[PDB]
């Protein structure tokens, strides 16, 4: 029983995360986030490891929530007549990366490097678990301000990871790759790398590079802030127009700009406290 197992508090983020409420697990006073999704509103369904019909979001969350990772973990879930209820970790204190960048402006490259690295490791974790997020953006990244750890959220546009072509997409269009805009076809890993290029530009420049379809497919990256040549090179490589010209995750993490990353605790002490 939901109300009998959790103390439920007020809405988190005034609805900006969805129907997500603050909560406390009564059995141990653990802080949780309680997310509600309406059955009528669910476009994509899947089967749990035991065949139960649940939202795809639950399928993917369950697949990535085993062990520690840079993903907000699903601790439990419940089915109601008209909805599903998801019990998630709630780190505290937190700020999402969109608000963090708005308030601080373009990030120092040392800080962007640490953040981007943690995002790469978290996306690699998802892929290793068979999960494609399909909506990587600063709004879907939480910063644990005390621990310096980044956490991926919102698998509501995700999919099981496959090596064949995707012809559906419901993520954020300004993070989506040119082959999606032009042909409505993309492969998972190279599309993710494109979105990561958008995210990295966002971090070091203070906002995303493209707002319009013509800019996404145009292939020109103007840098509006001072950005090192090594960082510009990585960004432009991630934003190669043709997917086969983009780096793999291995090539991103071996890139010269990515070397000598800070540890999460160092990141918190230097940049967040």
């Amino acid at each position: 029983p939901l109300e009998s197992q959790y103390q439920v508090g007020p809405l988190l983020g005034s609805g900006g995360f969805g129907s997500v409420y603050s909560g406390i697990r009564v059995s141990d006073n653990l802080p949780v986030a309680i997310k509600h999704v309406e059955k009528d509103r669910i476009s994509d369904w899947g089967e749990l490891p035991n065949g139960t019909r649940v939202p795809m979001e639950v399928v993917l969350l369950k697949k990535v929530s085993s062990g520690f990772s840079g993903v907000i973990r699903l601790l439990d879930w419940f089915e109601r007549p008209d909805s599903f209820v998801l019990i998630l970790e709630r780190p505290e204190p937190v700020q999402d990366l969109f608000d963090f960048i708005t308030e601080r402006g373009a990030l120092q490259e040392e800080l962007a490097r640490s953040f981007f690295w943690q995002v790469l490791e978290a996306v690699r974790h998802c892929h290793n678990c068979g999960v494609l997020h399909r909506d990587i953006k600063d709004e879907n990244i939480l910063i644990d301000l005390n621990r310096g750890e980044l956490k991926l959220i919102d698998f509501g546009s995700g999919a099981l990871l496959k090596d064949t072509v995707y012809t559906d997409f419901d993520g954020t269009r300004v993070y989506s790759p040119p082959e999606w805009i032009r042909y409505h076809r993309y492969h998972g890993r190279s599309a993710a790398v494109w979105s990561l290029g958008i995210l990295l530009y966002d971090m070091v420049c203070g906002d995303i590079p493209f707002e319009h379809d013509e800019e996404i497919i145009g292939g020109q990256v103007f840098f509006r802030q001072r950005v090192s040549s090594e960082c510009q090179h990585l960004i432009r490589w991630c934003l190669a127009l043709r997917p086969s010209d983009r780096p793999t995750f291995e090539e991103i993490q071996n890139h010269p700009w990515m070397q000598d990353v800070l540890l999460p605790q160092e990141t918190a002490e230097i940049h967040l406290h």
């Binding site: 969109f98 708005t102 909506d135 953006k137 709004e139 919102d154 509501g156 546009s157 419901d170 993520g171 954020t172 269009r173 300004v174 993070y175 203070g206 906002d207």
Partner: peptide, 8 residues
């Protein structure tokens, strides 16, 4: 320059 969120 305006900066904004984008819906999914």
């Amino acid at each position: 320059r305006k900066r904004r969120r984008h819906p999914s």
